[PDB]
Amino acid sequence: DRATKLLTYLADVTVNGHPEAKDRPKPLENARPVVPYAGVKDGTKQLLDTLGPKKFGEWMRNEKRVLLTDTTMRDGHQSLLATRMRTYDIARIAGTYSHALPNLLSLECWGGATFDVSMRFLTEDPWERLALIREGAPNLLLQMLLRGANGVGYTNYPDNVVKYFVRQAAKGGIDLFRVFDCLNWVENMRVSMDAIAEENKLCEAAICYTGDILNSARPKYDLKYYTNLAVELEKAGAHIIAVKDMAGLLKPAAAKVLFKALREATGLPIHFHTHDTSGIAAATVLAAVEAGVDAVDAAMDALSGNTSQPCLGSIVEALSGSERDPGLDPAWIRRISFYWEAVRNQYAAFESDLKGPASEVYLHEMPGGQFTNLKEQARSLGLETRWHQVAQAYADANQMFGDIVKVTPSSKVVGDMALMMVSQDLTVADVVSPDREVSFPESVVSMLKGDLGQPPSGWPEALQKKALKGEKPYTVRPGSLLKEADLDAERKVIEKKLEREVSDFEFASYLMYPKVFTDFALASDTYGPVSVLPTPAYFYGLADGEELFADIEKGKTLVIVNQAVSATDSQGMVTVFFELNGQPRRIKVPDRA
């Protein structure tokens, strides 16, 4: 029966294709990824277990070598492939990291858009993904990106929901939480931060970088701004401070000044995250290293550059033989990169048309992980030919909102405003004007009400009046207004709707994404453990006479040969003929054409 359900998925996708891939570019008809051939050395996970998060932070600070986080399994494909990377390809390589690169600080492999996209577009459970990475890499810290009060969502959730999710995240295998607020509002971070400390995990509290500290004509986001936030985050209980440069705006000279001041303002270790949209982010990471930074993020070469992180292999190689040499074997970095390259070839459907570095990024400030999603939304609205006016709008809308930190979900709001402006030919002067009528997007109404928080100088008065159209704003923390969710009764609703008990993890999914989770859980009961399928089989099914080996449970491999596919019958059904371990099986599926 589990095997029968799988055959049903393979039939369906063989006959009808997959909605996300069928109408997009295909992989070359030509070679599956090969896991390189190799107990594992204890690493940062064991140390953290030994020391506890606070002392583990001190250890990082005192460590001379720069510490490396690999982002390939989350930000890398979030930024380059619409986050469509699958568990099968991610989990299959964890053991290789574990054996080959046991010195790594952490694998960023969770949170961001992965939680949402796994269930919705990939038909898979993010919690199972985490558990398979945990088992494959028992010696490395597993790191997630946590959106503070938004969790893994796009809306501010109630305090008890936020706390419940963090508890399950830590139970599921998360050792290191990078937590941020999209307005750098420390008050909105305290609930998350406290909950991370209560699970006795690493709270790496992030400060989002924007502007240019070395440009005295933008004083709002100056050095003092960052050094103060660092100090405040320490008082709030951070184990580590992160600079999250989501748009890749930090320049080398600025890094040199920033990381020095930061390490003088707080004793906590500093972790630096950036994107390579400019084509020079590697120079910034290196400058940060020269200036004492304790840890940096990079992506494997094959999923690096442009809107992703800068090249991990080339950064390591730049540091090779130096005092701060991170002690990672370049031959193994290459082998792993060659794996990800062959992996990436399978996701041709989701490539963007980004051709290289663009200094334009310093003008628009679009986050790396948003840039391509937003280019799609603009195509969607017939704007493809006017992309450069969109980027100009985004920068204009930013100034109109008071010049703000733009990261998920504040970035999406500027996005929605920018798109509207271009579509309807509206200038800043018109959007605010009293004599021009404007129906603002639900996201802009929401933010201007105070649903995402408060910037330094509040929100601009006049823009806020016209937007709310009678509504009274609020300036307090959103979670302080929200009602503690009835958890026992919220559980009953989902358990009644699935006609079965659920696990604590599944309930957490439901709290974050009730509709996505529900739809996903009903799909799972139909199609089975489709995450065990190789990626070409998942997206395109099986060719006539093609043989597939799939491991259903740990013990047992299923041998599936697609022998033949019928025409559509009078009742609208197609019959796919299979061999399962040398036994014949027919499976009927609907012709969705």
Ligand X SMILES: N[C@@H](CCCCNC(=O)CCCC[C@@H]1SC[C@@H]2NC(=O)N[C@@H]21)C(=O)O
Q: Note the residues at the interface with ligand X (CB under 6 A).
A: 12-13, 16, 18-20, 23-24, 82, 120-121, 123, 350, 352, 372-373, 376, 523, 527, 592
Judged by beta carbon, residue 350 or residue 513, the one nearer Cl ion is 513
- What is the distance between the terminal CA atoms of the chain, rounded to a whole angstrom? 27
Exposure letters 60-91 (e unless 16+ CB within 10 A, then b): bbeeeebbbbbbbbbbbbbbbbbbbbbbbbbb
What does DSSP say about strands 240-245 and 67-70: parallel, antiparallel, or unpaired?
A: unpaired
Given 515, 554, 582, 593, the residue binding Cl ion (CB under 5 A): 515
Q: Which residue has the CB atom at the shortest distance from Zn ion?
A: 75
* Residue 60 counted as an annotated binding residue: yes
Cβ of residue 276: shortest distance to Zn ion, in angstroms?
10
Binds 75, which of ligand X, its own copies, Zn ion, none (CB < 5 to 8 A, cut-off by type)?
A: Zn ion
Can you tell me whether residue 10 is helix, strand or coil? helix
Judged by beta carbon, residue 19 or residue 458, the one nearer ligand X is 19
Is the N-terminal amide bond of 409 cis, ω within 30° of 0? Answer: yes
Backbone angles phi, psi at 518, to 5 degrees: -55, -60
Positions marked catalytic? 75, 244, 408
Cβ of residue 172: shortest distance to ligand X, in angstroms?
21
Judged by beta carbon, residue 73 or residue 179, the one nearer ligand X is 73
Please name the amino acid found at residue 157: Y
Binds 63, which of ligand X, Mg ion, Cl ion, none (CB < 5 to 8 A, cut-off by type)?
A: Mg ion
Q: At what angle do helices 387-400 and 410-423 cross, to 10 degrees?
A: 120
384 and 426 Cβ atoms separated by less than 8 Å: no
Judged by beta carbon, residue 15 or residue 400, the one nearer ligand X is 15
Interface with Zn ion by CB under 5 A: which range of 73-81, 167-175, 215-223, 450-458? 73-81
Residue 173: CB atoms within 10 A of its CB come to 21
Residue 92: CB atoms within 10 A of its CB come to 18
What whole-number distance in Å separates Cα of residue 159 and Cα of residue 480?
A: 8
Judged by beta carbon, residue 586 or residue 592, the one nearer ligand X is 592
Report the site for Mg ion in 18-77 (rule: CB under 5 A).
Answer: 63
* Residue 3 counted as an annotated binding residue: yes
Can you tell me whether residue 442 is helix, strand or coil? helix
Interface with Zn ion by CB under 5 A: which range of 69-77, 185-193, 322-330, 500-508? 69-77
String of DSSP letters for 159-180? HHHHHHHHHHHHHHT--EEEE-
Cβ of residue 121: shortest distance to ligand X, in angstroms?
5
Cβ of residue 239: shortest distance to Mg ion, in angstroms?
13
Cβ of residue 118: shortest distance to ligand X, in angstroms?
10
- 423: tokens are 């579509």
Q: How far is CA 81 from CA 78, 119, 315, in A?
A: 6, 16, 23
* Residue 75 counted as an annotated binding residue: yes
Q: Does 294 bind Mg ion (CB under 5 A)?
A: yes
* Residue 334 counted as an annotated binding residue: no
Spell out, one character per residue from 29 to 68, where the chain touches Zn ion: x when CB under 5 A holds, - when not. ----------------------------------------
Judged by beta carbon, residue 405 or residue 494, the one nearer Cl ion is 494
* Residue 70 counted as an annotated binding residue: no
Given 21, 56, 70, 75, the residue binding Zn ion (CB under 5 A): 75
- 140: tokens are 């490395």
State the Cα torsion 314-367-177-266 to the nearest 10°.
80
Judged by beta carbon, residue 299 or residue 374, the one nearer its own copies is 299
What whole-number distance in Å separates Cα of residue 167 and Cα of residue 195?
A: 7
Residue 295: CB atoms within 10 A of its CB come to 24
Given 56, 339, 401, 513, the residue binding Cl ion (CB under 5 A): 513
Interface contacts to its own copies, rule CB under 8 A: 30-31, 214-215, 251-253, 276, 278-280, 282-283, 286, 301-306, 308, 310-318, 321-322, 330, 333-334, 337-338, 341, 344, 355-363, 384-385, 388, 543-545, 563-567, 569-570, 575, 577, 584, 586
Interface with Zn ion by CB under 5 A: which range of 20-28, 75-83, 432-440, 573-581? 75-83
Q: 510: which residues sit within 8 A by CB, 6+ positions away?
A: 490, 494, 502, 517, 518
Interface with Zn ion by CB under 5 A: which range of 5-13, 71-79, 161-169, 411-419? 71-79
Binds 294, which of Mg ion, Zn ion, Cl ion, none (CB < 5 to 8 A, cut-off by type)?
A: Mg ion
Cβ of residue 287: shortest distance to its own copies, in angstroms?
8
State the Cα torsion 334-340-341-345 to the nearest 10°.
170
Count, residues in the chain: 593
Binds 478, which of ligand X, its own copies, Cl ion, none (CB < 5 to 8 A, cut-off by type)?
A: none
247 and 218 Cβ atoms separated by less than 8 Å: no
Q: 487: which residues sit within 8 A by CB, 6+ positions away?
A: 160, 164
* Residues engaged in binding Zn ion (CB under 5 A): 75
